[PDB]
Amino acid sequence: TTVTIVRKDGRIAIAADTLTKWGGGKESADYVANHEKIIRVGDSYVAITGSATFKLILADYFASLDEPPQLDSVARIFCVWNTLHGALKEHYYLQEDDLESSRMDVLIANPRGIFGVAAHRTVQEFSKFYAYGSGSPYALGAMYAAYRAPSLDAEAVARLGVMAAAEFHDESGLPVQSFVMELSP
Amino acid sequence: TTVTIVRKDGRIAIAADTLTKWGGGKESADYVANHEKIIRVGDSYVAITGSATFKLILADYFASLDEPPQLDSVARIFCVWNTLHGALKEHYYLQEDDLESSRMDVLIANPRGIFGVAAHRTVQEFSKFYAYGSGSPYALGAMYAAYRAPSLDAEAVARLGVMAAAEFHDESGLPVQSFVMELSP
Amino acid sequence: TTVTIVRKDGRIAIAADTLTKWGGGKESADYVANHEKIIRVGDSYVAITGSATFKLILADYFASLDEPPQLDSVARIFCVWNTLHGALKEHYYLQEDDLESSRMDVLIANPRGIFGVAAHRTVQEFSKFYAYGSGSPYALGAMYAAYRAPSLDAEAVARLGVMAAAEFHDESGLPVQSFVMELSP
Amino acid sequence: TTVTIVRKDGRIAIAADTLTKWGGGKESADYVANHEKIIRVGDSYVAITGSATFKLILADYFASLDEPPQLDSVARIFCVWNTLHGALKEHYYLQEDDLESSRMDVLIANPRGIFGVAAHRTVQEFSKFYAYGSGSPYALGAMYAAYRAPSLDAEAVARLGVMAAAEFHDESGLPVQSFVMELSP
Amino acid sequence: TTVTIVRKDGRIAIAADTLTKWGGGKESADYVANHEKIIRVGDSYVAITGSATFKLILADYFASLDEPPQLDSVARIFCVWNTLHGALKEHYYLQEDDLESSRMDVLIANPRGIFGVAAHRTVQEFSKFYAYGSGSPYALGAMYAAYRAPSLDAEAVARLGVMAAAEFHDESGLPVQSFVMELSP
Amino acid sequence: TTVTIVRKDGRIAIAADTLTKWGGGKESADYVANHEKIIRVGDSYVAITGSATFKLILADYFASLDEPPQLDSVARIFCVWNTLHGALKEHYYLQEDDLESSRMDVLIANPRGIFGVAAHRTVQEFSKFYAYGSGSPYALGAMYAAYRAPSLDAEAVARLGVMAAAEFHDESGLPVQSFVMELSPD
Amino acid sequence: TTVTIVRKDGRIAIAADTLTKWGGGKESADYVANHEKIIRVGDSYVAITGSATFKLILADYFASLDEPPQLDSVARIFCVWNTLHGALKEHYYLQEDDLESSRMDVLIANPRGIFGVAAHRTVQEFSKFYAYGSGSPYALGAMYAAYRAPSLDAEAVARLGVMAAAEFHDESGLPVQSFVMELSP
Amino acid sequence: TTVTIVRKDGRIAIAADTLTKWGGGKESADYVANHEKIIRVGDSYVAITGSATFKLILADYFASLDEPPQLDSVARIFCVWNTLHGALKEHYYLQEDDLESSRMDVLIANPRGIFGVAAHRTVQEFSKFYAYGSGSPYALGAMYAAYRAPSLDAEAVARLGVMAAAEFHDESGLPVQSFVMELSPDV
Amino acid sequence: TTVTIVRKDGRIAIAADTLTKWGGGKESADYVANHEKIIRVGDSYVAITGSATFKLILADYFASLDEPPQLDSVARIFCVWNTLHGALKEHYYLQEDDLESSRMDVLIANPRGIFGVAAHRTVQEFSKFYAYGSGSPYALGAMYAAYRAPSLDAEAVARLGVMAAAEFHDESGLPVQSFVMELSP
Amino acid sequence: TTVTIVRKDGRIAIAADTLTKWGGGKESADYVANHEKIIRVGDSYVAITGSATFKLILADYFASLDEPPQLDSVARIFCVWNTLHGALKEHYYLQEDDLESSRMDVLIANPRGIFGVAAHRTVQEFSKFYAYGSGSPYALGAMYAAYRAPSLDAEAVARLGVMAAAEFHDESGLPVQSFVMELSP
Amino acid sequence: TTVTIVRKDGRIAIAADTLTKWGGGKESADYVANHEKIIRVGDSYVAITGSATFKLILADYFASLDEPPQLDSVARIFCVWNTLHGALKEHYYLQEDDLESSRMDVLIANPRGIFGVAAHRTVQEFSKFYAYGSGSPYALGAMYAAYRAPSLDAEAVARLGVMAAAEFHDESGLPVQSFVMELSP
């Protein structure tokens, strides 16, 4: 998996590759209908790495809440993820470290910022771009190279990061899925 | 075990081999009468890999419910399987990974699509064909070869996948059980 | 232990060796008065492999029930054995795999058919013959060779499989106990 | 420890050595006054192997029951020992296998038959003789040789078994302790 | 991580580097908005090492109390941290040693002293300076060498320790955050 | 793999299955041309179990000796195999137990008797029948039931042994190969 | 890696993928110039699996020999590979099992037939087709499905085997290379 | 395996069961023609426990010697077994303890006495009887009971030892093989 | 470490970072005079990853050889490295895998092309660009995104590769060292 | 520690060394005031081995009982010790074998007999003498030799046993403490 | 095994038990004719613990030397044993610690003194008595108690040592073998 997220010229963009793995087996977007790794939660886009089951768990979990959660500040995202964690263990059968791992790394894009939440509930707000998943290093290199290119908007930089992972790494694959939105004032 | 599933030209088919193993020993359809690995649940056909007990657990479990479940969307199937897993542990004595394993992979065929659930509750809708079990690589290769052949409908492609596995792998054996049905409007 | 079961010409038959092992030590029928490995439950004969305590546990357990179970279908036998596993744990101090093990393989004969239940509660109806225990490989070989000899009825076949095991394996011993009954049409 | 039990010519006999061990330490009857490894439980004698504490546990446990248990059939003894195992865990601090081990093998004599219970509650009725404890192979050897000698009665045979073990094995020691009773009609 | 704390000439200062790590990967203040490792708690500054999630947990935890805690004495800080540790386990999913580790080392600067709390709740009041995190040995050496330079106030000595750590260790990176305040009478 | 050997009424027969395994993968005589597990060594037939490479090693080893070895007495077969084991180690890259394993269980049929050499160089002469390889229990069961049937000669019994194994075990498969010969006047 | 070999209608064909792996890193023919996995040895084609270093080793070794080897019978191939194994260990730094592993599986095409040599020096002549490498189960299934299709010649079958593998497994990737030759009379 | 050795009334006897094991598989004398576990070496009989290969190894070894070994004192037997052990490692592919195991226990009967050599080359002369193999304890107990029965000679006692083991232990089986000889008049 | 190599518009460029690591300690070019990771070998530039000792070893090795090696084809490079490995073991104290590891990955630039040798003597000629060392994922990412930009020659791209690694990974550090040359006809 | 108990000529005696160990450190009676290893319980003396804390525990435990326990028969002692073991775990933080170990061996002298209780609650009545602690072998040796000497009474023998252990074993040290009493009629 | 050595009133004695052990099995001097554990070497007697094989080894070794060794100084005995240890490994197949172990402890009595050599070739001369083997503790204690007795010579004392260990420990057994000699001037 590679997920990327970008902030540039008052535009916020998020992207994901589409390949699932089952061991060394490839399950591409060509063979799986529900191959999207980005789900909608309220007005946030949430890009998920880790087991392919997590996008089904989160969609189900968030949908089961009274209202969709606020994912627009670090404190709020953390607060939601910490509560999400107890549900993973208690309801969705989640299984050395400082803290217990939630086993997934997510990126969160919405009008009010670009964020990440690492497996250990390390919430971060990003200023330019970041990437998660095993393809992250490839994405970061490529986005670093093309971030300041005037010809590329946020979305094109996001997608380019996923493309670089997909070129070099066996856990990412084309096509790329992406979304783009305007930064709120 | 090999189970395959296929969707082609308005037809949905599902196929399983019929060989059960006890260690290195072979328990073929010629010696076991109840050698079918596909069960009926409502209007769905569920093909089951993993221990030969699971088809008895699932048959028992589903026959226990008030109404047959809904197995025609990813969201629905996921919910049914996430409830099934709790029952597996509690009432059926099921025994590292991100999430707990249900220790079986199933394929689901009905008039409203073809689906799969891996052991870790990864629910997937398939667009063409797929296969589970130790034999599935073989099945995948054979169905890739044959999917587009004009003389072969969905059922014949699914049956060929199991044959392929049964030819080269020691956990699959003939005869092949298959079912076919029309895709609904 | 070797236990066998055969269905031929409208006659069901079941058979077992009589030898108990205590480590390398041999505790034969000549020294042990309760050397029988087949018990009666309702109108079924149940031949039991594993620890020699299991025949005592099952007789005790099935006698404690309001009435004997029906062991005449795959579905029914599975219900019975899944409940029995619960009891083995809770009342009889029973102690990796997909499902928890019951530590015993059994064959079941009654007029309505010949069945088996493996340690992981894999219930199976057999069409010709089968065998359980460390001796079964020997028994199946012998019975495969002898099943179609006109001379030999169901009981003679069952018995011969146990003899073969006793000839060549150190956990099986003569004499052979066997029971025969007519196939309920 | 060696204990034997023999039935011959209308006589039943039970015997035990008298040596206790504490590591490589010897604690003979010369130094220990309570060196009896056989106890009385109603009209039954129970010869006990394993930890030297079990004779105390059993005596104390059986004394606490409203009445002495009937120990004169395989089924009855099994009931008793199954309930006993619970108490060993629950009251007397008892600590791989099919079933949990009670950590002792016993022989039981009474006027109605000879029996043994192994650590995993394998209750057995014997036709001639048997032995338990680390000295049993020596004892069985000896009693096999002596059993048919007309000049040796049941008790002579049972004692000779214990003698043989004490001759050759470092966990068995003289004097031999034996009891005899009449076979009921 | 490096955190330093300094007391000199009626002035109290606290510093931290800004670099976060994810494996061998660097997440600098350049890419992470919330790169601050120091938080406010009443009129104390708390500089936190260990998992980057802890600043989120602590901020969240202290915020949830009725009033901010008094963190101006060795006795009071301990009491607070002890209670905090319970919460870490009970609410924030905190997972050999003398006592349970809290998995973080902190420094506390307020107007009424400079303190630290190691991971096993060893509370200490410092009289000159100290440093925590993987970069402290570097910090202590640099601060040792510069404590008594008249040109350098408390905050210059605090920042310099961090700089030294950033120069030589792969878990510390510039910029240096810092705060200064007056000693209370 | 299953190999059977049988001695009955002045006839000697030897039989083997034909299936080779690569993990769980099957490699039947339908796909492999050289699927035979029995080789000829002089006027002996030698049925081999263990790695499919051993029949290549053995053919190669024996062909390289001045003449084909005498394999018609326990003592002679032993000397041959003890010397063979040194060559497995030195020339063909063979890798708890009392003795070193040769990693291979063989049956040897010839006009002068039926023999077997187990992996630990246990040389036996059999008087009726025997089987080696993972399928052998099935083979022993079957041949036990059939050995005394008048209608089945040494070869029929041997083949039936292999059939039984192939019927029930995942490392044996049809077709059966077999050879039969006359017992020498000894 | 996937390599295939096929014999059909008087023609022999051999085929390989071109992708090299470095952990999860992909090194496709698009970045690597020397991406061929098939080499010429005399008038044979040899398709190589295992470490990408093996093709260089064999090229080097065979080029060093006085005459190109004859790879046209099982016995011949066997002598050649047995001697090769000695050179792997001795000059090329080659590093549980019955026999030492040579760590690579090869397929050999020449006009006298199609052959294979597994890691353990298992020389096999094939009659129809075969495949090696981690991709081979898929290739086997594909080639099984297509082998008797009259519209596909030996080359088309061999290539399809590799394409099947590259569709579904992460250690195989296009382009496919192939070679075809005449069977000799 | 069970091997027994007995010295009684001026007579020396030695016995053995005839069953081989391959795992939990039985290879009885009914199916194996060379089921004997006792070999002649000069005028000694050597009964061998452990892997069935050892009887083949030992016959080969002793046949290759210039002259049969004299196996009629403790010091002579030790010397032979110590040399043998070096040959077991060097020529016959033998594989924690004080000393290296030879992996077999043997009993040696000859006119000049009855002896045993355990796996660690512990050579013993026996005064009455003894047994080796997994079936020894059963054989010992049985011979303990029957040694002084007046109707039984040394051979009957040695054989009885084997039969007790076969009765109760899965690694020993009938028939029993045995040999008997005269105690020489110089001992 | 990061080493990159680029082939573009008739020019060949090779580049490396300058940071040495001693555990978590940083030894930057600022503090180390011999911080260069590229050395000459003939007219070839060879960039070296793995232990900082290796450049001293190869310098010493090649300086003692007869005539410099010709590192201008795969076969030749392989020949040279295979023999090098024998010397690393024998004279320079080198210490699962198919082949023994040489423990360093190198890139090789000369006018006749660009090449790489991985730890297991896997010689590849590259057609566009590549990277080795723990930073290479970042570098490959970056260089993928910049390779086709007309404003950036071979050297600019190679350099950008290293910059990317150093931005995000703790084992790579600025400044970048690089060399460019002409492709020979 | 060594503790001994002796019965001779109508007298009972009991003794113990006075040395405590802290690792290889010695804590003699000369430095430790409460160096007694024997306590009073009713009219019984109880000599205690194992951890030096046990005598405090037992003294604390027995004092808290409504009245003193009767320690003058095997059945009664066991009863007492079995209850005690419960308290050790629950109240005094006591932590493979048949039964749980109470981690201490004791000897009990009273007017009505000599007894012991080993760690696993083996209660014994002795007829002459016995010893416990790491020094017991030495003490049983000395007392064996000196028992029948008319110049030594029960106390001299008991004291000589401890002296023998102090002579030769590094966990026993002089002085000896001893008590004597009259055998009751 | 117990061996003892004693020097008292111008006489020197040495003793040993006669029991051999094979596991838990006893081989008493009633069953083994060569049950002696003391051998002659010149005018020394040497008592041997460890495997029963060692007395055969030492006998064979010392008989093979040109002359019996001098064993009447610590310097001389050490020389002899150091050389002996080499012969043990080289000719007699002897198999963590400071020094290699010879795996036996011996006592050596001659007219010029009494000595011992421990497993690690610690040679000692004793002034009164000593003991080796697993029974030595019991023997030392007994000899400490008896050494001064006016009616017991050195031989009586030596034998009493052994007797005490045969009494209490499962690896020593009666009869005792002893020799005696006059201290030489």
Author numbering:
A (entry chain A), B (entry chain G), C (entry chain F), D (entry chain E), E (entry chain B), G (entry chain I), ...: 1 to 95, 101 to 190
F (entry chain J): 1 to 95, 101 to 191
H (entry chain K): 1 to 95, 101 to 192
What does the paper say about this structure?
The second hitherto unknown bacterial proteasome family member was primarily found in Betaproteobacteria, hence its name BPH, short for Betaproteobacterial proteasome homologue. In this study, we present the first experimental characterization of two bacterial BPH proteins. Their crystal structures reveal homo-oligomeric double-barrel complexes with internalized active sites akin to those of proteasome and HslV. Unique structural features, however, like an elongated inner pore loop with a highly acidic sequence, distinguish BPH from its relatives. Confirming an initial hypothesis, our cluster analysis shows that BPH branches off from HslV and appears to be its direct descendant.
In crystallization trials, we obtained for Td-BPH a hexagonal crystal form diffracting to about 2.7 Å and an orthorhombic one diffracting to 2.3 Å. The higher-resolution orthorhombic crystal form could subsequently be solved in space group P212121 via molecular replacement, locating a single tetradecameric double ring in the ASU. The tetradecameric complexes from both crystal forms are virtually identical, and most of the sequence is resolved in all chains from Thr1 until Pro-190. However, in both crystal forms, the center portion of the pore loop (between Gln-95 and Glu-101) is disordered. In summary, both BPH proteins unequivocally form double rings with 7-fold symmetry in solution. Prominent residues in Td-BPH are Thr-1, Asp-17, and Lys-37, with Thr-1 acting as catalytic nucleophile. Lys-37 corresponds to Lys-33 in the proteasome; its function is to facilitate deprotonation of Thr-1 (28). Asp-17 assists in this reaction by orienting Lys-37 and making it prone to protonation. Equally present are e.g. conserved Gly-50, which helps to provide the oxyanion hole that stabilizes the transition state, and Ser-139, which forms hydrogen bonds with Thr-1. The S1 pocket, determining substrate specificity, is of hydrophobic character, priming it for the accommodation of uncharged amino acids.
